[PDB]
Design a binder for this molecule. Structure first.
Ligand SMILES: CCCCCCCCCCCCCCCCCC(=O)OC[C@H](COP(=O)([O-])OCC(O)COP(=O)([O-])OC[C@@H](COC(=O)CCCCCCCCCCCCCCCCC)OC(=O)CCCCCCCCCCCCCCCCC)OC(=O)CCCCCCCCCCCCCCCCC
Ligand SMILES: CCCCCCCCCCCCCCCCCC(=O)OC[C@H](COP(=O)(O)OCCN)OC(=O)CCCCCCCCCCCCCCCCC
Ligand SMILES: CCCCCCCCCCCCCCCCCC(=O)OC[C@H](COP(=O)(O)OCCN)OC(=O)CCCCCCCCCCCCCCCCC
Ligand SMILES: CCCCCCCCCCCCCCCCCC(=O)OC[C@H](COP(=O)(O)OCCN)OC(=O)CCCCCCCCCCCCCCCCC
Ligand SMILES: CCCCCCCCCCCCCCCCCC(=O)OC[C@H](COP(=O)(O)OCCN)OC(=O)CCCCCCCCCCCCCCCCC
Ligand SMILES: CCCCCCCCCCCCCCCCCC(=O)OC[C@H](COP(=O)(O)OCCN)OC(=O)CCCCCCCCCCCCCCCCC
Ligand SMILES: CCCCCCCCCCCCO[C@@H]1O[C@H](CO)[C@@H](O[C@H]2O[C@H](CO)[C@@H](O)[C@H](O)[C@H]2O)[C@H](O)[C@H]1O
Ligand SMILES: CCCCCCCCCCCCO[C@@H]1O[C@H](CO)[C@@H](O[C@H]2O[C@H](CO)[C@@H](O)[C@H](O)[C@H]2O)[C@H](O)[C@H]1O
Ligand SMILES: CCCCCCCCCCCCO[C@@H]1O[C@H](CO)[C@@H](O[C@H]2O[C@H](CO)[C@@H](O)[C@H](O)[C@H]2O)[C@H](O)[C@H]1O
Ligand SMILES: CCCCCCCCCCCCO[C@@H]1O[C@H](CO)[C@@H](O[C@H]2O[C@H](CO)[C@@H](O)[C@H](O)[C@H]2O)[C@H](O)[C@H]1O
Ligand SMILES: Nc1nc2c(ncn2[C@@H]2O[C@H](COP(=O)(O)OP(=O)(O)OP(=O)(O)O)[C@@H](O)[C@H]2O)c(=O)[nH]1
Ligand SMILES: N=C(N)NC(=N)NCCc1ccc(I)c(Cl)c1
Ligand SMILES: [Mg+2]
Lengths: 96, 38, 459, 48, 347, 46, 320, 140
């Protein structure tokens, strides 16, 4: 494949590995989730633009809208977690 | 008359887990109403 | 078979819609009428089986087992109603419903043409039987008895299901009439060795085969009287009936595959007979006695001779009445002294003279006195296994001696000697109890006059 | 008047009882007809 | 929560699932999962306590991660085939990513850990949605991509879910965790037969939902979340103990009950394909489920546990919960085996 | 002059499965190991 | 319409019914402090519904025909026996207290239901909020064990958190030497066995713990035995309260729909009074509870749901 | 796995014992590493070295079980001159079971492992001879 797909795919894997390998802050994991969306956006846009598939030009915008909305929900859970414990540390989320 | 479970028999199923181990020795049954104290 | 299925189902509304104080009268009376009509199944032909429909048939193997099943329901009702007298009315009706639902599954099990239908019904009998033991047993370890009984069965029955479905795919059918004509020989291969074991192990557990038998004494010690009666008389014979049918499609592999089970049976019958000499629980002694008798049935089925199959059929019927009668006799003592310990209440012939006679007759049939059908069945098996190998007569003969020893030991220990001084509540035998004992032994002894109706298809 | 508080189901809900029975009668009539046109259509198609 | 908002949110949960089931475009499938996750989070949180917030967060993180893996597979699929049609995928790495994405959504082992955690932390009614309705959308996608799924991956996932689900339930005293592990094992049966006959996947799914809804509905009618609380049922509503007994025997696959049907039919399909070892192993492992189902029947219906004096006060009041559809569901949960040939309507 | 063993085996296997810390970090770390194994060992990506 | 989300959606919202009159008032005090007479006066002067103090048979009075049931259907809890023998080894003392907390809890849910469905205020005599003063006195006097107090607090923790406290707490203060005098004149043979130490413990809990806690969240009005006689002055004070504290100010229609959905379902209300905690004093063996339960079903109008009992004259059962 | 498993089956029974022992030890060690990876990830070791010790215990135990099985099973086939015999794997399976009893310092685990590993190994040989399928390709 073209050069770019290597690095974009590598970027997605890096953020996925970052997502699966938590540290302490829940916000850091949420950043890795949005990093994955970004690389999906770029890889989608490049594929759609290069093939000149015109109607799919909207697809990456739809992806950005829904992922941002998902990110807003994730942020809401983060603040509700932080209100309970005073931090967003994931090791506080072990009652279950 | 026919035997029925007593308190000692019933208390087997009241713990956090069915089979206690050293790993889960600190586990406690969750709150009755699901609400942990603030 | 609808003339038996439907009236059996109607026993349920009969029981639930009866007046509170008529539940035992009505269920007993009408179950006896169903038992009477069951004798219409004796229309057997020399060549063809009695094939009612696409679902059910009755040959000379299933007919005697059907009659025994429907005879046993009123006897279980009579035997149960005393220790359930304090139960509330709804729970009494639920108990009777389990017994009726057990009859329904059993008569369908014995008459199904297709083997998957037999499997489902064969499995369905587990539910009411398990519920009868765990809900209406007296002691704490009835819960464990249920799990042992449940999981011994399913450990063998699930491989049977896989084999049955595999056989239908290969052959195209599991209708037993079709299998008789489309059966093909089983060649040697590891695949066929496991097909053989999957086709047989479920029935071995039910019998039970020696070495897979420890669930049985556990179950009997915990079951209420009706549970023991149906378990000893009918539920064990489901495995015997299953083996007699499925061996059709296992030749010639049964030739060498039977050996380890024959060895277990031949030696197991001596071991379990000896164990009876040292049992201290009367119910556990009768349970071990069943294991020893059913070991003969397993040998008969595995060696596959016309004489052995006839003996197996007679032994299965004869044992069912005899063992059920012994549990009823043991239970009559228990309802007075509230213990199963055999040595607790001695010298009971002095106190209960007529019940001593029933004990005597039950013991005489248990040790197979000629010409009881107990001996007829045992003798036919002994005849046939001698041809299989002459040395078997040594183990057969030794087992006869030990069986006489423990059968009469039971009789001498409980009925003879001196009575226990402090046991002062041995009230006279009730009419219900005397009728119950006589309703076992009289038909058993009347079968001596016409044994042919219990000798099965090979007759 | 046994009950201290009037039970919720002291009196039958006559609107509900009428709707219930109307539904049962409607469904049975719709089913019976449905069967009849199915039988006629089946015979017509197969020439019976 | 306002009752109108609750209704609109529930309709959004259903709508997102329905979008997945009617969509021919991978993007709309992905939207349906996104819509569906957004609307279910508030019903997980509706009791507002630390355990519900933890469950909601764990659920969000799992489902969001699976949605990104799903979209990655879709985009890889677009690169190598240039189209978005929902069907077989045209790249084996896309197939593996989507299979693992869908396995995560279903909560199959080894992606199972969230199912007991999340189910315990949310109300019974929310747990009912999580373990039934939420299975439809991922299963409907697996129903369409199965020709391109790797057999070893799908069968490995199926075998692990049956093992983990069975062993996980043995150690449980919480009813919600019992349901969670029971659910994990049942998913393994559903996906094990998928490579052979998807119709038997649908049959297993429908019956599992019926039996699962019955148990949750009965737990809700009494407000029982633990085994010991459920052991007081005999001294309040004796009929419920009998119904719970029958449904538990059915969820264990005992004939002649309805729950025997899906395992019976799955064993048949596998053997028709000369698969003997796998169905045999699955059937025997399923005896683990039967053990801890039977344990509940012992403490609930077949014995009588000790009661408390204040229980007498409860005798004076009736059940006011709706228990909607329970009489129908319990009958279907237990008495459907004579109608097994009706499965052809799923073809 | 065994049911106990099978039951003991299952009981032990149950404590291995269910004795878990409840930590987000450890569960998602196990997802990475599963994904790595699925590729390197079994080649489920082919 | 039976109240539910549909009735709420169609306009059955609490704020339409409730006014400034919509107040929950409870009257507290020691034994023989005159709280009952004052409670009735406050109710009729302010036009509120009076609830007499919930006793052992409060639950009976709200179900069936309203008449008390035999004692075996309350567990044989006896206030008379509690006085005759406080340290009975049958566990009567705490069995009674655990029962009375459940009775008060039931009454509180009934009073809250009345307020939310009609808008009319209510007057209670003691409540789940003040029920612990008897627990504390029993424990300090050795009548109950510490394990009983642990059980009581568990039940209280997961029950009282669901409810709103009274708008107004009217406390009548009578000294222990006076209370003991009022008891003697009353002439109750069993109640005359009470000790001043027990009475003093009741007072300490009211002043040590109850009143300091209520004042944070309620309007607390205190009166002496003499001042409590002028019910017009007491009623005059209530009408001048500002109602500036407490959670009642945070409530709205949505949060009151949830509360009404709870208090109208008495089994939800009583769910945790029967937590499976095996305390000897409140645990009942299976054989006994099975036997008593069967007898209960045999009482008139108790076999079936209310409205489905032919033995008490219910009709049209085949259309209901 | 496919590469290593195919190597084991390619070598005929009772010939090239060392080559068989490498395949099983490699297979056993890989299984032990897999167990260690999950054990470390889910049950966190107290210290880094403690994690390294645990990986060595599981990885050596699994490799030792695999090594003895391949050695024992292949010698038996060679000594007995019975290549396509399931009993050789029954002997090998039990030997591996005993080592587990030794590593865990239990006679019960050794007795159970002998029976459970021995039957499993013998069934694998019947499956190879008879062509039994564990993950069967969809045919119908
Ligand atoms: C072949 C495979 C095997 C067989 C498959 C069969 C599948 C089952 C078929 C569906 C069975 C649903 C139950 C039928 C209704 C029976 C209950 C009843 O009589 O309600 C009468 C109902 C009121 O009865 P109720 O006293 O309030 O409570 C009845 C049940 O307890 C209330 O029980 P509920 O709380 O569970 O609610 C039941 C009903 C909601 O309750 C209802 O309003 C009845 C609606 C039933 C519709 C029946 C149509 C069936 C034909 C389908 C086409 O649910 C629905 O909305 C049905 C959709 O009267 C009506 O309003 C008639 C419906 C008018 C439209
Ligand atoms: C796990 C143990 C399974 C044993 C292996 C059975 C097997 O998979 O054999 C495959 C064979 C189907 O192969 P096929 O292509 O159809 O025909 C050519 C024969 N090679 O299958 C067959 O030919 C026969 C299949 C019969 C079904 C066997 C059922 C399970 C057998 C194991 C249990 C038997 C022991 C029962 C123990 C009960 C315990 C109480
Ligand atoms: C065939 C299976 C039939 C499934 C029927 C399920 C009936 C719903 C359960 C009845 C229990 C009574 C009830 O109240 O519903 C439970 C729940 C309501 O939640 P609740 O806590 O009672 O109050 C919410 C207000 N905040 O209501 C819910 O949350 C809905 C839960 C059920 C939705 C999933 C149903 C299963 C999938 C249906 C597709 C079948 C294929
Ligand atoms: C037809 C094809 C399909 C065939 C498959 C078989 C389907 C059967 C399952 C059907 C679905 C479940 C419905 C079962 C109906 C149960 C009816 C019943 O048991 O009686 C109810 C009784 C009521 O008790 P109560 O509230 O107190 O009112 C009476 C006053 N005592 O309750 C009680 O009194 C409680 C008594 C204690 C419980 C005793 C436990 C033993 C009774 C078990 C009977 C149910 C067996 C179900 C299991 C499946 C059977 C195969
Ligand atoms: C624990 C026991 C697990 C089995 C031992 C591992 C093994 O030897 O099988 C690994 C399996 C090899 O199978 P493979 O070479 O990929 O060819 C496809 C065969 N139908 O590799 C696989 O593809 C499946 C991996 C199985 C994972 C454990 C279940
Ligand atoms: C899909 C493709 C991947 C195939 C592999 C899937 C395996 C997934 C296993 C995830 C569930 C395992 C849960 C579990 O067993 O707990 C973790 C366990 C801890 O147990 P451990 O400490 O090793 O034993 C000694 C305890 N005294 O740690 C373990 O040892 C688990 C090892 C499982 C190996 C299989
Ligand atoms: C429309 C479709 C539905 C079709 C339903 C067809 C059957 C309808 C039956 C209605 C009559 C029910 O009858 C009602 O219940 C039972 C048995 O009947 C009777 O009461 C019963 O009590 C006990 C059993 O507990 C027994 O003495 C006896 O079974 C009977 O007297 C009631 O006194 C009667 O009022
Ligand atoms: C309580 C349980 C009792 C269990 C009793 C166990 C009995 C064991 C029977 C052993 C015989 C099994 O069946 C045996 O399988 C092998 C399969 O390889 C068949 O043999 C087949 O494979 C071998 C390979 O080694 C070839 O040499 C042979 O040419 C081929 O036909 C044999 O023809 C058959 O005899
Ligand atoms: C857990 C981390 C996940 C990270 C995911 C990162 C995205 C990676 C996308 C990789 C897509 C490459 O996909 C892979 O490309 C090569 C390029 O021809 C394909 O082609 C390869 O295999 C096929 C086999 O028939 C043939 O074309 C040829 O042998 C070979 O070139 C593979 O069939 C395909 O599987
Ligand atoms: C082959 C098919 C048939 C097999 C069916 C298997 C179904 C699974 C059965 C349940 C397994 C776990 O069940 C559990 O087992 C262990 C060990 O026996 C029991 O444990 C009990 O006995 C062991 C000793 O034997 C004690 O160390 C333990 O303290 C005690 O509690 C549990 O009381 C039981 O609940
Ligand atoms: N053990 C115990 N007794 C209680 C409890 N609540 C009330 N009582 C008893 O109920 C009896 C009557 O209630 P009281 O209000 O205190 O006395 P009263 O004279 O009838 O009422 P007033 O004078 O108007 O205040 C008292 O003797 C109390 O001992 C309680 O929670 N525990
Ligand atoms: N066997 C599969 N894996 N798939 C599948 N269902 N194939 C189609 C075979 C089939 C079976 C029953 C019916 I009714 C119909 Cl119409 C068609
Ligand atoms: Mg008063």
């Amino acid at each position: 494949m073209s050069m770019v797909y290597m690095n974009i795919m590598m970027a997605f894997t890096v953020s996925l590995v970052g997502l699966l390998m938590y540290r302490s802050h829940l916000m850091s994991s949420l950043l890795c989730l949005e990093g994955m969306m970004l690389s999906l956006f770029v890889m989608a846009a490049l594929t759609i633009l290069n093939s000149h598939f015109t109607l799919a030009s909207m697809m990456p915008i739809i992806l950005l809208v829904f992922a941002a909305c998902e990110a807003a929900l994730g942020l809401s859970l983060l603040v509700m977690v932080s209100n309970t414990y005073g931090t967003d540390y994931v090791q506080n989320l072990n009652l279950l | 008359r026919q035997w029925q479970p007593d308190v000692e028999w019933a208390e087997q199923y009241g713990g956090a887990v069915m089979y206690p181990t050293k790993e889960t020795a600190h586990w406690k049954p969750p709150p009755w109403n699901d609400v942990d104290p603030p | 078979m609808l003339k038996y299925i439907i009236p059996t189902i109607m026993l349920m509304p009969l029981t639930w819609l009866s007046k509170n104080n008529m539940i035992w009268v009505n269920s007993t009376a009408h179950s006896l009428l169903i038992s009477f009509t069951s004798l219409l199944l004796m229309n057997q032909f020399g060549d063809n089986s009695l094939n009612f429909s696409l679902l059910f048939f009755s040959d000379s193997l299933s007919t005697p087992l059907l009659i025994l099943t429907m005879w046993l329901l009123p006897l279980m009702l009579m035997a149960s109603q005393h220790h359930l007298s304090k139960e509330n009315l709804t729970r009494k009706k639920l108990f009777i419903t389990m017994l009726i639902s057990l009859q329904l599954f059993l008569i369908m099990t014995f008459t199904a043409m297709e083997l998957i239908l037999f499997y489902i019904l064969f499995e369905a009998t587990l539910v009411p039987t398990l519920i009868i033991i765990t809900r209406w047993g007296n002691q704490t370890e009835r819960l464990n008895a249920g799990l042992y009984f449940l999981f011994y069965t399913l450990a063998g029955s699930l491989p049977l299901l896989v084999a049955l479905i595999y056989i239908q795919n290969t052959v195209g059918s599991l209708n037993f009439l079709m299998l008789q004509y489309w059966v093909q020989p089983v060649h040697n291969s590891w695949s066929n060795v496991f097909m053989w074991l999957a086709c047989m192990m479920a029935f071995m557990v039910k019998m039970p085969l020696y070495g897979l038998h420890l669930w049985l004494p556990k179950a009997h010690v915990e079951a209420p009287i009706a549970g023991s009666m149906v378990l000893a008389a009918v539920l064990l014979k489901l495995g015997g009936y299953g083996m007699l049918r499925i061996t059709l499609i296992l030749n010639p592999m049964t030739d060498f595959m039977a050996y380890p089970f024959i060895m277990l049976s031949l030696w197991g019958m001596i071991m379990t007979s000896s164990i009876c000499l040292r049992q201290t629980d009367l119910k556990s002694l009768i349970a071990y006695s069943s294991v020893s008798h059913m070991a003969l049935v397993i040998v008969a089925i595995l060696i596959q001779t016309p004489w052995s199959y006839m003996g197996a059929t007679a032994l299965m019927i004869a044992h069912g009445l005899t063992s059920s009668m012994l549990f009823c006799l043991a239970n009559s003592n228990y309802e007075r002294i509230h213990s199963r310990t055999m040595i607790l209440a001695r010298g009971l012939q002095t106190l209960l003279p007529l019940m001593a006679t029933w004990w005597l007759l039950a013991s005489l049939t248990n040790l197979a006195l000629p010409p009881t059908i107990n001996l007829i069945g045992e003798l036919f098996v002994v005849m046939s296994t001698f041809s299989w190998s002459n040395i078997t007569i040594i183990l057969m003969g030794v087992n006869m001696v030990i069986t006489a020893l423990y059968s009469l030991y039971m009789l001498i220990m409980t009925q003879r000697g001196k009575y226990t001084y402090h046991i002062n509540n041995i009230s006279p035998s009730f009419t219900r109890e005397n009728a119950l004992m006589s309703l076992h032994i009289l038909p058993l002894l009347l079968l001596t006059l016409n044994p042919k109706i219990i000798l099965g298809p090979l007759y | 008047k046994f009950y201290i508080q009037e039970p919720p189901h002291g009196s039958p809900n006559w609107l509900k009882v009428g709707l219930t029975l109307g539904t049962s009668v409607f469904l049975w009539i719709y089913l019976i007809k449905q069967h009849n046109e199915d039988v006629l259509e089946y015979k017509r198609r197969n020439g019976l | 929560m306002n009752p109108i908002i609750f209704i609109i949110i529930l309709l959004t949960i259903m709508l997102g699932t329905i979008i997945v089931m009617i969509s021919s475009h991978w993007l709309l499938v992905w939207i349906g999962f996104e819509m569906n996750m957004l609307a279910i989070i508030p019903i997980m949180m509706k009791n507002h306590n630390p355990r519900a917030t933890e469950a909601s967060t764990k659920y969000f993180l799992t489902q969001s991660t699976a949605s990104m893996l799903l979209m990655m597979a879709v985009i890889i699929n677009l690169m190598f085939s240039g189209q978005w049609t929902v069907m077989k995928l045209f790249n084996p790495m896309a197939s593996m990513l989507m299979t693992m994405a869908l396995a995560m959504k279903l909560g199959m082992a080894p992606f199972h850990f969230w199912v007991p955690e999340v189910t315990q932390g949310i109300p019974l009614s929310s747990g009912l949605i999580l373990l039934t309705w939420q299975k439809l959308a991922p299963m409907s996608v697996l129903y369409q991509i199965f020709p391109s799924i790797n057999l070893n991956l799908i069968l490995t996932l199926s075998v692990l879910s049956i093992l983990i689900g069975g062993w996980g339930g043995l150690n449980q005293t919480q009813l919600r965790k019992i349901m969670a592990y029971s659910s994990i094992a049942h998913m393994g049966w559903m996906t094990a037969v998928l490579p052979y006959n998807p119709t038997m996947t649908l049959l297993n799914l429908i019956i599992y939902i019926i039996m699962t809804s019955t148990m949750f509905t009965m737990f809700m009618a009494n407000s029982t979340t633990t085994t010991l609380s459920l052991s007081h049922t005999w001294n309040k509503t004796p009929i419920m103990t009998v119904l719970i007994l029958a449904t538990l025997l059915s969820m264990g696959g005992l004939p002649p009950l309805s729950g025997f049907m899906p395992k019976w039919m799955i064993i048949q399909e596998m053997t028709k394909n000369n698969s003997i070892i796998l169905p045999t192993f699955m059937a025997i492992t399923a005896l683990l489920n039967l053990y801890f189902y039977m344990r509940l029947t012992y403490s609930t219906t077949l014995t009588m546990f000790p009661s408390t004096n204040n229980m007498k006060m409860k005798w004076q009041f009736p059940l006011m919960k709706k228990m909607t559809f329970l009489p129908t569901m319990v009958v279907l949960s237990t008495m459907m085996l004579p109608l097994t040939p009706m499965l052809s309507v799923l073809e | 002059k065994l049911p106990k063993t099978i039951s003991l085996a299952q009981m032990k296997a149950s404590t291995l499965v269910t004795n878990q810390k409840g930590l987000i970090k450890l569960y998602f770390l196990s997802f990475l190991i599963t994904i790595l194994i699925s590729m390197i060992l079994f080649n489920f990506h082919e | 319409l039976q109240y539910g989300p549909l009735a709420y959606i169609l306009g059955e919202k609490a704020t339409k019914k409730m006014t400034e009159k919509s107040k929950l008032i409870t009257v507290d005090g020691n034994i023989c402090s005159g709280k009952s007479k004052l409670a009735k006066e406050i109710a009729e002067k302010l036009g509120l519904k009076h609830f007499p103090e919930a006793g052992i048979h409060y639950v009976d009075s709200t179900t069936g025909d309203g008449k008390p049931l035999p004692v075996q259907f309350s567990g044989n809890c006896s206030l008379e026996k509690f006085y005759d023998d406080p340290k009975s080894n049958d566990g009567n003392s705490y069995r009674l207290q655990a029962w009375l907390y459940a009775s008060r809890l039931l009454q509180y849910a009934d009073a809250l239901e009345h307020l939310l469905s009609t808008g009319q205020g209510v007057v209670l005599e003691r409540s789940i909020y003040s029920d612990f003063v008897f627990l504390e006195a029993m424990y300090r006097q050795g009548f109950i064990r510490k394990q009983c107090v642990d059980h009581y607090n568990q039940v209280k923790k997961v029950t009282i958190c669901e409810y709103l406290p009274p708008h107004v707490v009217v406390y009548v203060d009578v000294p222990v030497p006076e209370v003991q005098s009022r008891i003697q004149k009353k002439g109750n043979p069993h109640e005359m066995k009470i000790t001043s130490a027990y009475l003093q413990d009741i007072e300490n809990a009211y002043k040590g713990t109850f009143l300091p806690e209520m004042s944070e969240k309620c309007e607390v009005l205190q009166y002496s035995a003499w001042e409590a006689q002028d019910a017009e002055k007491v009623v005059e004070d209530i009408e001048y309260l500002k109602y500036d504290k407490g959670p009642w100010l945070d409530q709205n229609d949505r949060k009151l729909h949830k509360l009404r959905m709870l208090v109208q379902d008495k089994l939800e209300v009583l769910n945790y009074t029967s937590i499976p905690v095996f305390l000897p004093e409140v645990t009942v063996g299976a054989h006994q509870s099975d036997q008593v339960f069967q007898e209960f079903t045999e009482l008139p109008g108790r076999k079936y749901r209310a409205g489905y009992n032919e033995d008490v004259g219910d009709k049209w059962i085949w259309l209901k | 796995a496919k590469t290593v498993l195919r190597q084991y089956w390619d070598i005929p029974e009772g010939t090239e014992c060392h080559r068989k022992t490498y395949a099983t030890t490699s297979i056993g060690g890989a299984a032990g590493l897999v167990v260690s990876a999950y054990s470390v990830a889910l049950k966190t070791p107290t210290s880094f070295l403690e994690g390294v010790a645990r990986t060595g215990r599981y990885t050596f135990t699994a490799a030792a079980i695999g090594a003895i099985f391949g050695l024992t099973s292949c010698i038996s086939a060679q000594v007995r001159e019975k290549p396509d015999d399931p009993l050789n794997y029954l002997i090998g399976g039990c030997a591996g079971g005993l080592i587990l009893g030794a590593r865990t310092r239990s006679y019960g685990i050794g007795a159970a492992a002998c029976a459970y590993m021995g039957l499993t190994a013998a069934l694998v040989k019947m499956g190879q001879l008879e062509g039994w399928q564990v993950f069967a390709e969809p045919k119908v």
